[PDB]
Amino acid sequence: INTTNIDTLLVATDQTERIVEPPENIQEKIAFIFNNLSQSNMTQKVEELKETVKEEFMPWVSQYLVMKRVSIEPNFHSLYSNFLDTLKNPEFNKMVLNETYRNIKVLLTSDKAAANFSDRSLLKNLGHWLGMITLAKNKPILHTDLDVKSLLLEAYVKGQQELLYVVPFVAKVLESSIRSVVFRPPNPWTMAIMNVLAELHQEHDLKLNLKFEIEVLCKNLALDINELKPGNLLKDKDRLKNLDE
Amino acid sequence: GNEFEDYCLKRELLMGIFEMGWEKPSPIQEESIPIALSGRDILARAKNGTGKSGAYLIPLLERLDLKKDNIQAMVIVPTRELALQVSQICIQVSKHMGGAKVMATTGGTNLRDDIMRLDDTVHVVIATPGRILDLIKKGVAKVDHVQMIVLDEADKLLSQDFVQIMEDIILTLPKNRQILLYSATFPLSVQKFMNSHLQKPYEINLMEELTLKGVTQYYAYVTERQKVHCLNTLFSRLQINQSIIFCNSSQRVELLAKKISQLGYSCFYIHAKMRQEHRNRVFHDFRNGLCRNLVCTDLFDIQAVNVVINFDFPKLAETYLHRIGRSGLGLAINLITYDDRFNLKSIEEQLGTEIKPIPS
Amino acid sequence: EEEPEWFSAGPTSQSETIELTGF
Numbered sequence: 001i002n003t004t005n006i007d008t009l010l011v012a013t014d015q016t017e018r019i020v021e022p023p024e025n026i027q028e029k030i031a032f033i034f035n036n037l038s039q040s041n042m043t044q045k046v047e048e049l050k051e052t053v054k055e056e057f058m059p060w061v062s063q064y065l066v067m068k069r070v071s072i073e074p075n076f077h078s079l080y081s082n083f084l085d086t087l088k089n090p091e092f093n094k095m096v097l098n099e100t101y102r103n104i105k106v107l108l109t110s111d112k113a114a115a116n117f118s119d120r121s122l123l124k125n126l127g128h129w130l131g132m133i134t135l136a137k138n139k140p141i142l143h144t145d146l147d148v149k150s151l152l153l154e155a156y157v158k159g160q161q162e163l164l165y166v167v168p169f170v171a172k173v174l175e176s177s178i179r180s181v182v183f184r185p186p187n188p189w190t191m192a193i194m195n196v197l198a199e200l201h202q203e204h205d206l207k208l209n210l211k212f213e214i215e216v217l218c219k220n221l222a223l224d225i226n227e228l229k230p231g232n233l234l235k236d237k238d239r240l241k242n243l244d245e
Numbered sequence: 246g247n248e249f250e251d252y253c254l255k256r257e258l259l260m261g262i263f264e265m266g267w268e269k270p271s272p273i274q275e276e277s278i279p280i281a282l283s284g285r286d287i288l289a290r291a292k293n294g295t296g297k298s299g300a301y302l303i304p305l306l307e308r309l310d311l312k313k314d315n316i317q318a319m320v321i322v323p324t325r326e327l328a329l330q331v332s333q334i335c336i337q338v339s340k341h342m343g344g345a346k347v348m349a350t351t352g353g354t355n356l357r358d359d360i361m362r363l364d365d366t367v368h369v370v371i372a373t374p375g376r377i378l379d380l381i382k383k384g385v386a387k388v389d390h391v392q393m394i395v396l397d398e399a400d401k402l403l404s405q406d407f408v409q410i411m412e413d414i415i416l417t418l419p420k421n422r423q424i425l426l427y428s429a430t431f432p433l434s435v436q437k438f439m440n441s442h443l444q445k446p447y448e449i450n451l452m453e454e455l456t457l458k459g460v461t462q463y464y465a466y467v468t469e470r471q472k473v474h475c476l477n478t479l480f481s482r483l484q485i486n487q488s489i490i491f492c493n494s495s496q497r498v499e500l501l502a503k504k505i506s507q508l509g510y511s512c513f514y515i516h517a518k519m520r521q522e523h524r525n526r527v528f529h530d531f532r533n534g535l536c537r538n539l540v541c542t543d544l545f546d547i548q549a550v551n552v553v554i555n556f557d558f559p560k561l562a563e564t565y566l567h568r569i570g571r572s573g574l575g576l577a578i579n580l581i582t583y584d585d586r587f588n589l590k591s592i593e594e595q596l597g598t599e600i601k602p603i604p605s
Numbered sequence: 606e607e608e609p610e611w612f613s614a615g616p617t618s619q620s621e622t623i624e625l626t627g628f
Contacts, residue, residue, distance in 0.1 A: 017450075105431075109431065109432050109433045109436060110433070111433060138591070138594070138595065139595060140561070140562050140563050140595055142563055142566075143563065144292065144429075144454065144455075147430075154432075157405055158405070182591055182595065187560070187561075188560050188561055189561055189563070239406055242406065243375055243406060243407075243410075244352035244375055244376075245324070245325050245328075245351040245352025245353055245373035245375055245376060463627070464627050465625050465626065465627060466626060466627055466628065467623075468610075469609065469610045469611060470610035470611055470614050470615075471611070471623055472611045473611040473615045473616055474611075474615075474616055474621050474622065474623045475623055475625065477616060477619050477620070477621055477622055477623075478622045478623055478624075478625055479625070480619075481619070481620075481622060497609060500608070500609055500612045501609075501611075501612075504611070504612055504615060508616065508618065508619045509619050510619075581627075601627070602626065602627020602628060603625045603626065603627050604625070605624065605625060605626055
């Protein structure tokens with residue numbers, strides 16, 4: 001019923017290593033700034049936040065930005081991304097990236113049976129954001145931060161309900177690769193992920209809307225889906241033999 | 246405190262640590278050892294390949310009572326290779342304790358022979374999940390005195406095919422067993438296992454990353470035709486203990502290896518288009534110093550290696566980082582053709598590092 | 606695919622040395 005419920009993320013935060021919470025009034029000024037951020041006042045809002053938020057409140061700001069804003073405001077992802085570019089604070093950028101990963105994994109590893117209606121969307125939104133502030137800015141998504149290719153293999157094994165969450169998430173991340181000088185096709189990292197999706201696409205029983213996701217992603221990356229090179233990574237892995245060490 | 250002597254281990258065990266050449270506790274050791282010594286369960290986020298063994302084997306050994314011929318501690322690992330590695334480190338660290346028996350048992354060790362082995366005293370079992378459960382269920386491995394179990398790389402132990410196997414193992418053990426859990430990642434399965442079994446665990450988040458710090462990086466503008474000549478120059482000027490020479494294809498690895506061998510180099514080679522068992526054999530001989538240089542593709546911790554050559558420059562910044570990064574070496578040298586020049590500056594930027602022109 | 610330039614048109618001796626530069 002609620003398209004923007006972030007309770008899944010909030011409850012997970014109430015169990016993260018507690019951080020410095022700013023006073024209520026500084027908290028209020030931060031909310032004001034992000035409520036009123038636009039392209040026309042961005043430079044001033046950056047100076048505003050700098051003159052208002054002490055350095056020790058930075059972790060809380062990255063948490064506020066990622067969990068409460070970015071998660072449910074995909075229409076302002078470019079704005080918030082451009083805000084990071086204007087602020088030019090590399091340490092804040094890493095907090096934001098870490099928080100992004102943290103909330104993404106909270107959703108990926110949630111028991112989907114107990115999920116909120118909004119969680120599929122929250123994950124797609126955070127995926128879209130992740131691609132924008134990494135690949136789109138010519139920064140790699142390191143496998144030690146998020147192993148995207150393995151994520152797909154693992155989802156395949158867990159089944160369709162997992163694939164329903166994971167495949168649109170991967171699509172949203174990879175959309176930014178076409179805007180990346182580094183990661184656009186035929187970058188090997190992007191292409192390996194695309195070749196796994198092609199393998200998925202070949203599954204006769206993969207749900208139609210997931211086949212559609214993959215085919216639309218291909219068009220967005222200017223890739224002929226028929227020219228992809230799917231392997232046998234899905235099958236493959238002698239799971240019976242592997243039981244013997 | 247922060248010295249091994251502060252942990253008040255048995256003198257025999259400290260002598261073991263001394264003989265390993267372990268002078269000062271690593272951060273994972275510093276975080277794990279005093280808590281584990283107290284008896285608390287541990288929940289640790291550490292990368293694969295991090296020296297977790299060095300952290301958890303010490304309190305494990307300290308806990309042993311060698312006056313009892315019973316199995317008292319177990320380390321469960323997901324691969325034959327980790328089992329070998331951990332049991333070796335454990336046998337060395339405990340070599341002064343007088344009668345401590347460590348046994349490794351996996352799908353790769355002969356079951357009949359392992360059963361005979363367990364007729365004699367064994368205090369510490371290092372094992373893959375499948376084999377040790379099979380041994381417990383056959384009554385061959387008696388585990389009613391096990392007071393500590395370690396799960397190393399718990400995410401692989403708790404993948405879909407293995408979660409029940411691990412559950413069955415846990416259910417055969419004394420309910421009050423201390424558990425030490427280490428994992429790079431935390432899927433639902435690991436989260437579930439944690440909640441059920443761990444008892445108010447001490448949490449450790451010690452994620453050492455691969456870094457370029459302390460690695461001197463150089464490049465040399467070379468044409469493809471000149472690459473071996475450049476290699477000739479490098480190996481006539483540097484001091485190489487051991488080196489690793491990376492190429493971008495299996496075909497190029499073989500051709501290079503066969504070429505420089507004919508030129509009198511010491512090398513083995515390894516690439517993707519080989520049987521795995523052959524691959525492991527060669528790598529094991531390289532580690533034991535039977536050649537000086539390994540030519541290879543990207544397939545990946547060998548202390549003697551002090552020089553890495555990127556004979557072909559990689560396409561991905563992450564590949565570059567895996568080739569020359571370290572957890573916590575010496576020299577990295579990049580051969581750069583005209584067509585590599587973009588990736589050179591690009592990878593340099595992505596990794597926020599510097600790759601300097603090589604000195605003349 | 607093809608056979609490398611340094612395999613075919615390479616050196617027939619280790620003493621064949623070139624100058625090292627990033628310039």
